Amino acid sequence: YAALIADWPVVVLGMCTMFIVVCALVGVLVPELPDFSDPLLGFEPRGTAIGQRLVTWNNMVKNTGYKATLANYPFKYADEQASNFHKDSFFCDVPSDRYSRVVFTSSGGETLWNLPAIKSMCNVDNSRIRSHPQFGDLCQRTTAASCCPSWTLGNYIAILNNRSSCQKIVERDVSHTLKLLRTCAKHYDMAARRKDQLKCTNVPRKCTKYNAVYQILHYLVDKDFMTPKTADYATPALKYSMLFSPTEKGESMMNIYLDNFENWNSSDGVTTITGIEFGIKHSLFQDYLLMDTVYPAIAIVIVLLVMCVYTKSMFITLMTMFAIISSLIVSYFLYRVVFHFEFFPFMNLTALIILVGIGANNAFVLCDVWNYTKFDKPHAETSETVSITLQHAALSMFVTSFTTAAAFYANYVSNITAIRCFGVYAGTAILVNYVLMVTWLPAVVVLHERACQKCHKVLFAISEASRIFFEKVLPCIVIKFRYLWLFWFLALTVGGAYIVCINPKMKLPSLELSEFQVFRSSHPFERYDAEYKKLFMFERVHHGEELHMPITVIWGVSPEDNGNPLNPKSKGKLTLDSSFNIASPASQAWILHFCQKLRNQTFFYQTDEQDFTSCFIETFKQWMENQDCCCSHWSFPYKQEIFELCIKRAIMELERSTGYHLDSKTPGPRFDINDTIRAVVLEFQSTYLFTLAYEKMHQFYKEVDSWISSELSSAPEGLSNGWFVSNLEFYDLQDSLSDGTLIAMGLSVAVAFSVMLLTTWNIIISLYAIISIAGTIFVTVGSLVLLGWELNVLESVTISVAVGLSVNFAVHYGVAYRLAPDPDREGKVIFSLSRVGSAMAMAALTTFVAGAMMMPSTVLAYTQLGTFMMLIMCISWAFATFFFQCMCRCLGPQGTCGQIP
Numbered sequence: 074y075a076a077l078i079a080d081w082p083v084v085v086l087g088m089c090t091m092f093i094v095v096c097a098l099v100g101v102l103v104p105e106l107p108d109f110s111d112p113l114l115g116f117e118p119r120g121t122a123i124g125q126r127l128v129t130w131n132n133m134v135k136n137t138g139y140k141a142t143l144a145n146y147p148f149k150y151a152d153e154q155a156s157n158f159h160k161d162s163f164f165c166d167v168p169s170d171r172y173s174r175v176v177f178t179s180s181g182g183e184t185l186w187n188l189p190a191i192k193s194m195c196n197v198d199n200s201r202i203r204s205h206p207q208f209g210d211l212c213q214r215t216t217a218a219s220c221c222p223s224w225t226l227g228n229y230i231a232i233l234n235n236r237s238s239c240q241k242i243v244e245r246d247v248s249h250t251l252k253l254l255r256t257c258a259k260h261y262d263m264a265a266r267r268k269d270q271l272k273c274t275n276v277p278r279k280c281t282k283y284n285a286v287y288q289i290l291h292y293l294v295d296k297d298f299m300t301p302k303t304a305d306y307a308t309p310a311l312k313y314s315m316l317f318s319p320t321e322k323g324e325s326m327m328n329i330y331l332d333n334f335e336n337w338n339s340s341d342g343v344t345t346i347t348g349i350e351f352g353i354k355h356s357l358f359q360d361y362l363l364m365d366t367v368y369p370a371i372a373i374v375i376v377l378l379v380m381c382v383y384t385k386s387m388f389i390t391l392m393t394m395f396a397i398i399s400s401l402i403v404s405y406f407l408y409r410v411v412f413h414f415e416f417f418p419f420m421n422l423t424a425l426i427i428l429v430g431i432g433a434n435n436a437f438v439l440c441d442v443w444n445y446t447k448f449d450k451p452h453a454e455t456s457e458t459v460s461i462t463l464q465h466a467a468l469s470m471f472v473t474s475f476t477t478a479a480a481f482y483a484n485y486v487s488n489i490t491a492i493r494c495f496g497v498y499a500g501t502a503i504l505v506n507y508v509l510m511v512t513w514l515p516a517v518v519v520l521h522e523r524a525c526q527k528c529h530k531v532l533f534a535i536s537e538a539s540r541i542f543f544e545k546v547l548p549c550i551v552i553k554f555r556y557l558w559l560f561w562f563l564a565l566t567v568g569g570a571y572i573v574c575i576n577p578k579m580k581l582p583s584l585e586l587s588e589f590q591v592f593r594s595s596h597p598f599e600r601y602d603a604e605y606k607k608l609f610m611f612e613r614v615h616h617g618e619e620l621h622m623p624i625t626v627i628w629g630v631s632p633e634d635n636g637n638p639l640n641p642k643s644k645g646k647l648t649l650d651s652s653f654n655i656a657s658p659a660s661q662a663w664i665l666h667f668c669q670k671l672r673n674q675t676f677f678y679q680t681d682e683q684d685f686t687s688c689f690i691e692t693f694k695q696w697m698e699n700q701d702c703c704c705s706h707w708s709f710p711y712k713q714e715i716f717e718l719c720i721k722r723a724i725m726e727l728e729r730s731t732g733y734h735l736d737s738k739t740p741g742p743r744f745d746i747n748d749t750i751r752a753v754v755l756e757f758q759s760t761y762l763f764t765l766a767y768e769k770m771h772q773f774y775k776e777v778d779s780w781i782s783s784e785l786s787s788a789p790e791g792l793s794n795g796w797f798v799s800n801l802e803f804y805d806l807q808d809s810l811s812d813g814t815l816i817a818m819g820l821s822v823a824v825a826f827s828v829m830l831l832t833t834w835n836i837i838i839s840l841y842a843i844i845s846i847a848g849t850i851f852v853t854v855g856s857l858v859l860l861g862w863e864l865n866v867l868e869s870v871t872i873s874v875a876v877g878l879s880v881n882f883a884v885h886y887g888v889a890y891r892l893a894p895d896p897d898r899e900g901k902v903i904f905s906l907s908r909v910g911s912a913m914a915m916a917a918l919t920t921f922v923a924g925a926m927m928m929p930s931t932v933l934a935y936t937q938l939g940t941f942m943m944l945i946m947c948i949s950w951a952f953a954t955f956f957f958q959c960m961c962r963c964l965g966p967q968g969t970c971g972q973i974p
């Protein structure tokens with residue numbers, strides 16, 4: 074093979090170039106452009122035995138009945154034969170959470186009860202919001218000039234006074250309202266009085282305006298809550314104050330934020346803006362993404378310089394960077410076209426950075442080996458030199474790349490879709506980059522055969538410095554101490570294990586699915602949702618608003634998920650039916666007995682006022698004991714000939730008599746299009762309060778499912794029947810994250826250990842390598858959990874990639890343990906050090922820098938990836954070198970080897 078790369082470089086160069094050009098061209102032309110519109114799109118498990126039920130339930134809700142061509146699941150249609158408002162008080166409506174808002178703080182002295190702060194609120198509202206051309210104002214009064222007031226606290230100060238305006242303040246109404254709140258705050262024990270002209274019930278005081286006090290304490294500023302155990306001084310300090318806006322929130326608002334809020338720190342010296350809610354956190358996202366392609370580019374540039382210092386040429390560095398980019402391109406082509414599945418979950422974006430930190434990890438090695446094979450046997454042909462260097466470097470480069478490739482492929486086990494796609498893409502990228510490192514680089518190396526004094530002398534100075542560093546002093550500083558490092562790293566390993574296994578481990582996520590932190594942790598959009606949603610009362614009351622958890626039993630459809638689950642488009646499913654029957658009287662009696670028994674439990678909650686949300690057979694039987702209509706005065710289980718008609722007549726009569734809305738969620742039995750009772754749906758109220766934690770939800774699900782699983786029913790409606798499905802999907806996400814992470818970590822560790830054992834043929838060295846990998850994993854994850862982290866759809870992949878990146882700085886030191894000198898421990902170490910220390914140090918430094926350049930970004934994935942890469946590379950290099958070399962006091966010259974070659 075070596076004869077090919079020799080004397081024929083341009084051939085393979087042109088061939089690879091044409092292959093890459095056609096690959097890029099097809100991959101750009103044929104498939105469609107990715108969306109990036111939704112930052113979170115694949116974060117839903119599939120085929121987890123609960124995701125199937127959630128999908129089937131959401132499909133059942135989708136196909137509601139319609140008066141005109143229901144076309145599926147109508148309620149009764151085939152047989153159906155039909156033939157506040159005042160404009161006074163300057164305000165439109167009570168405050169709600171469907172209007173845009175901001176929050177002011179950061180005053181001098183931490184107190185805003187003063188004319189400056191209120192006037193600044195009014196001024197910034199008039200300047201940054203009203204001045205922009207806007208048509209979203211309510212304009213309750215037909216006059217556009219009186220569209221709506223600014224809704225500040227000064228407006229309430231004014232309306233509590235006789236003269237009302239945003240500007241004209243007397244400074245006496247301020248003190249009046251301060252005393253008013255100081256004396257009537259204890260009444261908040263009360264609710265909205267609706268003081269149009271007076272209130273009905275016995276009120277605490279008859280000096281209440283149109284819900285003035287209740288609004289100012291409930292919806293507006295509520296930091297202190299005005300009921301603490303502080304001093305009797307009627308002047309307490311308030312921290313944060315919220316200000317609404319009459320216009321609605323949504324994608325329409327985004328324009329305003331583009332113009333006035335991006336660059337401006339604070340409008341006034343006395344007030345600032347520390348939290349904003351316009352409802353555009355997930356729509357603006359895409360834009361910032363583009364704005365943060367600066368930091369990657371710079372990183373790439375820096376990398377080049379480093380290589381241009383190590384490999385003295387620039388040709389090699391340029392061709393290596395081209396090889397990496399080419400690998401990304403051809404990997405995308407293999408991803409979208411031949412593999413045939415279509416989804417680009419934006420996590421693949423953060424793949425680029427990773428590859429830049431791993432593509433060079435081999436280049437150096439190759440070049441290095443070449444130079445060595447050039448020092449020995451100087452007078453030689455290119456073919457034999459190429460064959461020698463290939464035999465010396467190919468196996469090591471393949472092990473180094475394939476371990477990480479396997480670690481990235483092992484994420485094809487988890488159920489989430491984003492993780493699956495990211496794993497497949499990154500694995501293919503790494504393997505293709507290895508193939509290019511084996512084919513493209515030898516060609517360019519062979520082909521490369523070709524104030525100067527100052528640059529040359531300083532470069533030689535740097536070269537001799539690096540040589541004397543990695544050749545003399547590092548072996549001494551590593552092998553002389555030899556006892557501080559052992560105990561130090563054992564202490565660090567034990568501490569990491571204690572932080573991962575005993576003291577607070579990686580807590581499962583707590584924010585809801587719709588409120589994932591996507592931007593930086595200091596952006597206004599994120600600071601609001603992190604703190605001020607929890608510090609204000611009008612949203613804290615909704616937070617855990619005593620919502621009980623429902624049950625749901627369905628017999629019609631079958632829990633069958635068929636939506637191309639193999640990396641789906643995350644779209645497209647289908648419903649279906651079954652072959653049971655509910656017509657037999659035995660089935661009716663069994664349903665009655667099932668309801669009677671299910672009410673005899675400890676998880677069922679009782680309310681005494683259920684009309685129809687409970688079982689329908691009970692309400693139907695209650696509709697009996699009547700006549701003059703046909704069937705009356707019979708036994709309970711009927712011959713179903715009358716029942717087929719009575720079940721329509723009764724449901725029609727009841728839906729006519731009561732029920733303003735009974736569609737798409739109510740437990741009424743579901744008919745087919747023409748004539749039958751296809752599906753039935755029962756629901757009950759439980760007593761578990763819908764916590765957001767994991768343990769309680771797990772307990773509830775396990776208990777209710779284990780109880781309802783026992784059916785022992787008639788032949789019809791017994792199979793495909795159980796179908797307990799509550800609103801538990803966040804618990805599904807948490808469980809899927811946990812299981813996927815565990816299994817992927819296990820597989821990655823197994824592959825790493827197997828490859829490390831098969832590459833050296835020595836168990837004594839494999840054991841030390843395993844100890845080092847374990848220590849690195851433990852310390853890295855301990856540091857990550859100390860900084861404050863939690864399992865998400867990124868850290869779950871990072872934990873698995875850490876194992877793959879760990880063995881890198883150990884396979885090389887194990888391979889470099891094959892040499893001529895005999896001495897067991899104090900020998901055969903300086904050789905490996907002086908030979909591979911420079912390569913390992915440079916290979917770690919380049920990815921350290923390429924990861925550290927991501928810190929100033931704004932998107933959160935970039936920051937997290939940067940800090941993780943920095944941490945893992947520092948810790949892995951330190952452990953590998955110091956530990957692995959220092960713990961070589963236990964190996965001899967013929968400890969152990971393999972049996973048969």
Ligand SMILES: CC(C)CCC[C@@H](C)[C@H]1CC[C@H]2[C@@H]3CC=C4C[C@@H](OC(=O)CCC(=O)O)CC[C@]4(C)[C@H]3CC[C@]12C
Binds near residue numbers: 083086395520
């Ligand atoms: C598509 C891009 C990204 C890669 C293109 C790769 C090749 C088509 C190019 C890249 C650099 C080129 C080389 C740049 C310089 C030279 C030296 C040139 O000879 C001289 O400069 C004369 C003096 C001497 O040889 O001493 C002969 C062509 C050659 C080998 C070129 C051959 C074609 C090469 C390998």
Ligand SMILES: CC(C)CCC[C@@H](C)[C@H]1CC[C@H]2[C@@H]3CC=C4C[C@@H](OC(=O)CCC(=O)O)CC[C@]4(C)[C@H]3CC[C@]12C
Binds near residue numbers: 363366373394398
């Ligand atoms: C240094 C070399 C070897 C690699 C460079 C990698 C990146 C820094 C490059 C590759 C893709 C480039 C992007 C390709 C396309 C676009 C869209 C382009 O969009 C517009 O010009 C929008 C305005 C308009 O179209 O009128 C702006 C530059 C940008 C983000 C480019 C920015 C620079 C990127 C990220």
Ligand SMILES: CC(C)CCC[C@@H](C)[C@H]1CC[C@H]2[C@@H]3CC=C4C[C@@H](OC(=O)CCC(=O)O)CC[C@]4(C)[C@H]3CC[C@]12C
Binds near residue numbers: 414482639
């Ligand atoms: C150690 C390494 C070399 C092992 C192989 C790793 C990857 C090359 C493999 C692992 C799992 C594979 C995937 C497993 C299953 C599928 C579904 C498969 O579906 C079909 O073939 C559908 C055919 C049709 O109906 O048209 C397409 C390839 C794909 C994505 C595979 C692509 C190649 C993958 C990523």
Ligand SMILES: CC(C)CCC[C@@H](C)[C@H]1CC[C@H]2[C@@H]3CC=C4C[C@@H](OC(=O)CCC(=O)O)CC[C@]4(C)[C@H]3CC[C@]12C
Binds near residue numbers: 109359363369423
């Ligand atoms: C992997 C990173 C570290 C390097 C840079 C690559 C990406 C960050 C670049 C390459 C392609 C770029 C995209 C190319 C085209 C578009 C479409 C563009 O669409 C619109 O402006 C409107 C679309 C519509 O609504 O129809 C928005 C920016 C976006 C997503 C760009 C965002 C930035 C992207 C993803």
Ligand SMILES: CC(C)CCC[C@@H](C)[C@H]1CC[C@H]2[C@@H]3CC=C4C[C@@H](OC(=O)CCC(=O)O)CC[C@]4(C)[C@H]3CC[C@]12C
Binds near residue numbers: 460462464508
């Ligand atoms: C799909 C295409 C474009 C690329 C496929 C990759 C092959 C071109 C690579 C993959 C692994 C390579 C092999 C890896 C290692 C060796 C051992 C090497 O052994 C020697 O020359 C021994 C020299 C000595 O005695 O020191 C000979 C080349 C060879 C077979 C390599 C030949 C090129 C191979 C087959």
Ligand SMILES: CC(C)CCC[C@@H](C)[C@H]1CC[C@H]2[C@@H]3CC=C4C[C@@H](OC(=O)CCC(=O)O)CC[C@]4(C)[C@H]3CC[C@]12C
Binds near residue numbers: 864
């Ligand atoms: C290889 C090393 C780095 C560990 C990698 C995994 C850990 C970083 C994470 C992933 C899954 C996590 C677990 C996911 C779920 C749970 C159950 C959770 O259970 C409860 O809260 C109590 C009720 C119960 O025991 O189920 C306690 C934390 C724990 C063990 C977590 C502990 C930390 C784990 C093992």
Ligand SMILES: CC(C)CCC[C@@H](C)[C@H]1CC[C@H]2[C@@H]3CC=C4C[C@@H](OC(=O)CCC(=O)O)CC[C@]4(C)[C@H]3CC[C@]12C
Binds near residue numbers: 574822850
């Ligand atoms: C190279 C290898 C050796 C690295 C380490 C891999 C495993 C040996 C680690 C990774 C995750 C660890 C687990 C993380 C969390 C737990 C839960 C812990 O139990 C609880 O937290 C129970 C809490 C409760 O009572 O609700 C017991 C240890 C265990 C199983 C740990 C056992 C050791 C595990 C499997």
Ligand SMILES: CC(C)CCC[C@@H](C)[C@H]1CC[C@H]2[C@@H]3CC=C4C[C@@H](OC(=O)CCC(=O)O)CC[C@]4(C)[C@H]3CC[C@]12C
Binds near residue numbers: 856859860947948951
């Ligand atoms: C022989 C020497 C050169 C070895 C050096 C390697 C370790 C001793 C270093 C490298 C990574 C360092 C860690 C990187 C990050 C952190 C997290 C950091 O966390 C916090 O500061 C938590 C509190 C907070 O900031 O809110 C505490 C220090 C620590 C554990 C560092 C401790 C020292 C570590 C383990």
Ligand SMILES: CC(C)CCC[C@@H](C)[C@H]1CC[C@H]2[C@@H]3CC=C4C[C@@H](OC(=O)CCC(=O)O)CC[C@]4(C)[C@H]3CC[C@]12C
Binds near residue numbers: 925928
């Ligand atoms: C051995 C030689 C060749 C290199 C040694 C490099 C270190 C001495 C320096 C150079 C780059 C430095 C980093 C450059 C940028 C940052 C980001 C910086 O970020 C913040 O302060 C976070 C701000 C926030 O919380 O928003 C923290 C320090 C850090 C990691 C620096 C840590 C110290 C580093 C690694």
Ligand SMILES: CC(C)CCC[C@@H](C)[C@H]1CC[C@H]2[C@@H]3CC=C4C[C@@H](OC(=O)CCC(=O)O)CC[C@]4(C)[C@H]3CC[C@]12C
Binds near residue numbers: 382
């Ligand atoms: C070995 C030779 C060839 C290269 C050595 C490079 C380092 C000496 C320098 C050059 C570029 C530096 C980086 C340039 C920019 C930044 C971003 C900077 O970001 C912040 O300070 C974060 C601010 C924030 O929190 O918003 C942190 C230091 C860092 C990583 C620097 C760390 C030190 C680096 C890598």
Ligand SMILES: CC(C)CCC[C@@H](C)[C@H]1CC[C@H]2[C@@H]3CC=C4C[C@@H](OC(=O)CCC(=O)O)CC[C@]4(C)[C@H]3CC[C@]12C
Binds near residue numbers: 936937940943947
């Ligand atoms: C000089 C080099 C060769 C050896 C010593 C390196 C340490 C001084 C570096 C390595 C990792 C660094 C840490 C990497 C990341 C962070 C997170 C950073 O906080 C953020 O930017 C936000 C993090 C987040 O949001 O998750 C604060 C600095 C810190 C602890 C860095 C502190 C300095 C550390 C320990």
Ligand SMILES: *[C@@H]1O[C@H](CO)[C@@H](O)[C@H](O)[C@H]1NC(C)=O
Binds near residue numbers: 235236237
């Ligand atoms: C203040 O109150 C008096 C009597 O209650 C009323 O006549 C007067 O109009 C009020 N002030 C203003 C500016 O309306």
Ligand SMILES: *[C@@H]1O[C@H](CO)[C@@H](O)[C@H](O)[C@H]1NC(C)=O
Binds near residue numbers: 338339341342
């Ligand atoms: C914000 O920066 C501007 C100049 O860019 C400055 O005039 C203003 O005083 C700053 N804000 C504060 C609160 O000082």
Ligand SMILES: *[C@@H]1O[C@H](CO)[C@@H](O)[C@H](O)[C@H]1NC(C)=O
Binds near residue numbers: 669670672673
């Ligand atoms: C359920 O309620 C009480 C005991 O909880 C009992 O009198 C009644 O008979 C029970 N019903 C059934 C069907 O067991």
Ligand SMILES: *[C@@H]1O[C@H](CO)[C@@H](O)[C@H](O)[C@H]1NC(C)=O
Binds near residue numbers: 747748
């Ligand atoms: C509608 O129901 C009638 C019942 O007799 C049946 O004959 C017919 O095939 C049904 N049509 C469809 C499209 O299911």
